[PDB]
């Protein structure tokens with residue numbers, strides 16, 4: 121793996137991370153407005 | 163079980179200590195290696211107030227400097243909020259205004275707000291003068307206190323105080 125490829129991979133993983141966080145937020149809204157009990161921690 | 167249920171949310175920059183304030187209050191636990199929070203969670207703790215059993219429902223989520231799809235639901239029904247910053251990182255204090263604005267745009271108008279300067283154990287690295295934060299709080303009608311989730315200083319007091327103001 122070349123240097124350019126490694127830097128591109130970091131950028132790619134960071135972009136994916138943003139998309140995953142956005143998706144989690146979208147899905148969580150539904151949960152919070154239906155059955156938020158699953159969000160409890162102990 | 164309880165007489166009153168009060169929803170209180172934690173807000174503030176990533177890394178200021180929100181999750182450890184939650185763990186200290188609800189489980190008497192601190193984790194120096196805690197990782198950034200994923201999703202949204204809440205934990206409960208029952209305390210005594212004026213002879214009444216109060217069930218505090220504390221909500222937590224990562225402090226992402228961005229509007230989120232969960233924002234509306236997060237503040238919904240909340241009667242209290244802890245706006246947290248890191249006394250050792252002036253940047254987290256500068257962002258307090260941004261968090262307060264977000265709160266004013268989604269939370270109930272009568273929500274009780276307490277400005278919390280966490281990580282007081284790092285006083286040797288203080289970057290936010292106590293007097294300045296207190297001035298900002300009183301100016302915006304916010305309670306104020308400095309805490310250390312690490313050594314536990316004022317953590318119980320912070321929650322007890324805000325819950326007492328709510329009730």
Ligand SMILES: Nc1nc2c(ncn2[C@@H]2O[C@H](COP(=O)(O)OP(=O)(O)OP(=O)(O)O)[C@@H](O)[C@H]2O)c(=O)[nH]1
Nearest residue numbers: 176177179180181182194198199224225310311312
């Ligand atoms: N020195 C010191 N460190 C603390 C204190 N409270 C939390 N920390 C540490 O600061 C780091 C961040 O703490 P967290 O509680 O995960 O911060 P957070 O606000 O929940 O961060 P996000 O979930 O990313 O929004 C961790 O390494 C904690 O152990 C404190 O009072 N003093």
Ligand SMILES: [Mg+2]
Nearest residue numbers: 180181198199
């Ligand atoms: Mg957290």
